Amino acid sequence: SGAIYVGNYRVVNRHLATHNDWANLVWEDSSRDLLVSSTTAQGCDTIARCDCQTGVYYCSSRRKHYPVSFSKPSLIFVEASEYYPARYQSHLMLAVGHSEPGDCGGILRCQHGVVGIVSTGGNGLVGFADVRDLLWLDE
Numbered sequence: 001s002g003a004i005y006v007g008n009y010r011v012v013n014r015h016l017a018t019h020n021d022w023a024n025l026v027w028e029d030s031s032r033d034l035l036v037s038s039t040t041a042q043g044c045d046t047i048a049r050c051d052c053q054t055g056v057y058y059c060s061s062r063r064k065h066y067p068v069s070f071s072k073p074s075l076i077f078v079e080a081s082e083y084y085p086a087r088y089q090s091h092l093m094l095a096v097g098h099s100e101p102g103d104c105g106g107i108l109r110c111q112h113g114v115v116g117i118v119s120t121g122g123n124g125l126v127g128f129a130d131v132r133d134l135l136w137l138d139e
């Protein structure tokens with residue numbers, strides 16, 4: 001679990017979104033596993049605007065942060081789950097690191113700010129849904 005709070009927006013994994021998230025829907029993209037809902041309270045996370053390939057993510061299944069090198073956002077094949085059939089997920093970045101399903105939502109950050117959130121994993125790899133291209137999150 002986990003979310004990004006920036007301005008009047010809440011960014012979560014689309015497969016973990018709640019009824020309140022869907023009743024206050026701003027945008028969602030199943031191909032990215034992202035959903036953005038509106039909030040009453042103001043958010044203070046800074047979204048990074050860069051092409052960094054190094055950062056640190058929070059791994060709830062170890063209660064620890066890990067430094068990682070990660071790939072550029074791209075279309076990557078993702079195994080079927082109870083949330084989606086087998087498909088290409090877009091804007092996904094992979095790193096070598098530990099992750100379990102409940103780790104989704106953990107933030108990946110670089111020196112510039114929030115890069116994305118844990119969205120996939122398996123086989124000693126962890127995948128992050130990028131949010132750096134969502135320029136509208138700031139306005």
Ligand SMILES: COc1ccc(C(F)(F)F)cc1NC(=O)N1CCC[C@H](C(N)=O)C1
Pocket residue numbers: 015033078081083084089099100101102103104118119120121122123
């Ligand atoms: C952080 O996620 C995991 C981490 C590790 C493993 C394991 F196979 F090793 F057990 C599995 C997962 N689960 C996932 O990758 N997904 C299930 C939830 C929906 C995700 C999506 N974006 O389509 C895909």
Ligand SMILES: [Zn+2]
Pocket residue numbers: 048049050051052110111112113
């Ligand atoms: Zn950066």
